[PDB]
Write a protein that binds this DNA or RNA. Sequence first.
RNA 1: AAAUAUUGGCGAGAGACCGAUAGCGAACAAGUACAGUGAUGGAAAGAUGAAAAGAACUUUGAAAAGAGAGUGAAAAAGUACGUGAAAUUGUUGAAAGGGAAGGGCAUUUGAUCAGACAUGGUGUUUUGUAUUUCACUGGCCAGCAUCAGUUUUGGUGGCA
RNA 2: GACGUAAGUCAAGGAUGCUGGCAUAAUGGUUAUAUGCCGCCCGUCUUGAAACACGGACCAAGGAGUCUAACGUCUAUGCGAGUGUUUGGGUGUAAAACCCAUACGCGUAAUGAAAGUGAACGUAGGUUGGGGCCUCGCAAGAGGUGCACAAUCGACCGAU
RNA 3: ACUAAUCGAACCAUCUAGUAGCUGGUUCCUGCCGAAGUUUCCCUCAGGAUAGCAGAAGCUCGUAUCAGUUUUAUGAGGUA
RNA 4: AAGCGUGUUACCUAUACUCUACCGUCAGGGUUGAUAUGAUGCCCUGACGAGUAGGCAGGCGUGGAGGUCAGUGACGAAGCCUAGACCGUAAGGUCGGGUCGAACGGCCUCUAGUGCAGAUCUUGGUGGUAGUAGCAAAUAUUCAAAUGAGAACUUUGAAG
Lengths: 185, 127, 167, 148
Amino acid sequence: GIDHTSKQHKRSGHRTAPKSDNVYLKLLVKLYTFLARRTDAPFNKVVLKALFLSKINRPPVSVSRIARALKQEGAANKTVVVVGTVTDDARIFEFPKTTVAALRFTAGARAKIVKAGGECITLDQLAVRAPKGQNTLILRGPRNSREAVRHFGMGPHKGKAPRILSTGRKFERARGRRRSKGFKV
Amino acid sequence: ASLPHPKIVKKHTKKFKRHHSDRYHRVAENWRKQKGIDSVVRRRFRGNISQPKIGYGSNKKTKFLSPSGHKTFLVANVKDLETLTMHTKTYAAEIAHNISAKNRVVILARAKALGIKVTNPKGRLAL
Amino acid sequence: SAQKAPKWYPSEDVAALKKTRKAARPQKLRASLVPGTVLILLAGRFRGKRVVYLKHLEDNTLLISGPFKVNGVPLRRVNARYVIATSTKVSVEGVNVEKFNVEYFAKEKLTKKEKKEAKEIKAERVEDQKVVDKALIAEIKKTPLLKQYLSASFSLKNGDKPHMLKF
Amino acid sequence: PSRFTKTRKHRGHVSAGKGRIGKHRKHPGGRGMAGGQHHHRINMDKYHPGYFGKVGMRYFHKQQAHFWKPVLNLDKLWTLIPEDKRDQYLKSASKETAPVIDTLAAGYGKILGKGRIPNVPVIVKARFVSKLAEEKIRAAGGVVELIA
RNA sequence: AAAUAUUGGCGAGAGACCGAUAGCGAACAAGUACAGUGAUGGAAAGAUGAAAAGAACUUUGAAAAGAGAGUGAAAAAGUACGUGAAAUUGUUGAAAGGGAAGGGCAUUUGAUCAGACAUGGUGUUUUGUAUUUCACUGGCCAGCAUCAGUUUUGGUGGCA
RNA sequence: GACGUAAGUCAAGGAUGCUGGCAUAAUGGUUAUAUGCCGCCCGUCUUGAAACACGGACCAAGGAGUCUAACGUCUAUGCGAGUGUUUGGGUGUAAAACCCAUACGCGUAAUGAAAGUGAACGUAGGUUGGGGCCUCGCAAGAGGUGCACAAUCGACCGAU
RNA sequence: ACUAAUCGAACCAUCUAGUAGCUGGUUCCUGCCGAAGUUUCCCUCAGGAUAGCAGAAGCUCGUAUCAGUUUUAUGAGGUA
RNA sequence: AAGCGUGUUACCUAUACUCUACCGUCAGGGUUGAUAUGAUGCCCUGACGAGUAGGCAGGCGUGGAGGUCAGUGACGAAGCCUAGACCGUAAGGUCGGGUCGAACGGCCUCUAGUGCAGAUCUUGGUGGUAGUAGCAAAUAUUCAAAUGAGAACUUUGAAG
């Protein structure tokens, strides 16, 4: 007998392999797991870990975010790495020249980078030039900006978005919402 | 004379029958849970049937092995045996029920000449 | 193809035996089993037969020769666990046991072809048995009643206690 | 499909996933949001505040046509111009002949003021504008013209 | 007029449909037999065999029918007819059996069942040159010796 | 590691050596019975079932968390500030497949009840922590940099 | 009382698969984890809603802001 | 005392603990410049394993769709029986024997009216209860001949 102090036979709770089925991605995973295991730089050990993430967990990193990382001093020549795809943007107008490696790039994204003189490559070519990740930088997409992130944390005095298919006046704007009617939250 | 293997043990030879399958002809012989609440067999009152559990698993280096020392593998024609010919040491060819006798004779002749062990050589023989 | 195939094909090469760290350590006999002591056979053709121990072999077995003229038991080899030693010890220095060895006790060549499906002592065996008993009979005769002791069988009485018996 | 529906896995278990004690009935708590004021009060309040009751005057025959009002933030302003001429227009800021953007033809109602447009002359023809969207484009030298 | 519905009727074509306790209630003489005064209700019942070639004829029996025979690829297809399961029953055989029997652990007994390796094989002259005509192995089960691990049980030594 | 001057040996990171008998019911399997001990009749309700609680004579077949409109979370996929061809049109080997314009939905701005109004002083702010990266550092470590994200204070739009 | 063996509201069909917090049943395997009968509110007491209790999906990180614990010091309590 | 009270030891046994083997789960890992079936694989280490409701995963099976196995098949498919065997922990699969006569499998994927012991379940069928209860109101029949194979019930006669 054992006084099991916790969840015995507990699973890690961390993704072991990407539960998706794209063979190319699994091929790419086989690349980094050899790299992460046989290297020492903690860089690749985190790039691979973020590779298992879901569609929501790999949000589209805007090239505008990329430009901001370029504006981050001490990183002018640093190559940019983004797990997940990268989209183009209309807010910005002049993207400084650099090289960016990421999963995917939209039609405008590839166009904007190339017409910026940039150099987009895959994670494979990323390994080729930077085995241990020489002067790289990892950029993660915004994760607290989805729909349902505003929908969690419900409760009175919580002030979070209410899940409602229909939206507008006379919907969730009655007693209990304003102290005028009944109470307020 | 195959690759020698660790000494064989099934670790529970007796087959698992459903509770009270003996006394009722409409209880299917194949094993099942019997997930009632009153069930004596659902929790293993000593002196009653022990439901299958992992610990009754065989050894990994014996899984799917014949007591003769082969992993059986059935066949239906000469061409299917060709994928086996190199591996006479580990796999044993086997003839299916739905193979004609005149088909069996050419199969057996081919297999025996190749020395591939066969596990139903005496089926549907003509005498 | 009513059963397609196993993809992962197991190997066929036999991995060699591990270099086990075991050695042929020589046998160390007991205190009561001394060359020249009187033994009693326990199991086999000659159960309960009084005999005399001659020489331990490199076959970790006991060359035993009760006087074949006396007990009708000729020279042969027995296993250590199957004999009880008796404090009665005789002299064996006067008899030589040099040429009794494993190849001399080679029973016969058995194979899978020249086999007697249905169902002749070597002459030289008799004389070497004779030459051994020459000194042995002259030796055993030095003390009274021992000839009869080696002649007679051995059997337990009623209620006699081996745990209390002193051989 | 159906073979992955866990009722298939559940098959054999007496309650089929709805409990031995509860013994899933037809409609225990009523139908719909029944009893929102009697025995569902807390859910209809602590998850859905402001459910029961009304507010605001009742608009009769409210036609969506009048309240059509797409929003065009100044960052999105340059999207209307074609990509091939977009770069051509970012460079060579031509006050003498500056591009026009027909947000109305683009079906964009009112110009808003998210800001940060390059200091180039741009003519904007939109139904509505803000206070500072005018200011920001005025700072960039652009003028705005009004079309219904 | 058109574009639009159509489970009625007819016609036409299809089905990732059902396959005779399903599918129309109805695959068959079904809205039938059958019940109810009536309003109504409402069945069960598809398949021998390629071909009836549907068992002539002989015989016992009053006859049915049986035994023969004969047709038939099959009569273990005979109109009580594709295959023919079980519950149930009979017969034979096998067993056991003192108010249950039935099951689990393991074993005896009895019945009954696959497997070894009997290898091209330490080769050893083809009767006008491919039988190595002696085996090399491990199949099973044991015993002994030496060990390693776990541990048990003493007996003796020195010491504080 | 020990023994060893070494050579190597070894009780040293998991059993070898030798011998015998048999090669089949011999071992083993299954089974039937007997034996020792044990075993309540199962499903369900209940705190409590073996119950003097209820269903269950038996057996074969049928037989029960499906479908869909709207969605939620999560995941997978494509695209991605867009997105969605299949309302329709063209086309066709023809209910297929392929192609195509239009708007149109949802997001790309919210906010008020409404009139309306509608998000940059700042490097899109600061602070704290923050993976990773970079500089130095044999290496700790030091710094610089800090994505996402956590909390806070700001700023801006709307409402009062 | 009787109104076709049906009567304190006949019978036939449709609505209609009327209804149900109530009873009964809910069909394969094996793994891994693993409960509650409690807060409050309800014409609420055989039921619901919530909080809790469970699993699963995981995510950010890597030895910590921790601990059904003791000790030091320091309180506070009105039971024996 | 085989009682009481007390104490000394020795001993017996739990799925208790310790050691080992094996299985599975989990955790940590290691495993590609010509070394491996080219990795959700293999390998190493260690810790664990109860459990209804409930949850999740990996699995077998049924009806069908697509592709594939130039799969099986009248010298015998499916089904069925089989104290015959084999494989799996099981879902089950495979083979052998017998009947049988015409379609059916394995793999990958897809789909579903998809897995039975229950529901005073349905339909159909057969039981023990069983050659038993019962076949007893109405006074009541008998002899003979005849038909007929067969007569208590048929005919007739003679009675009552």
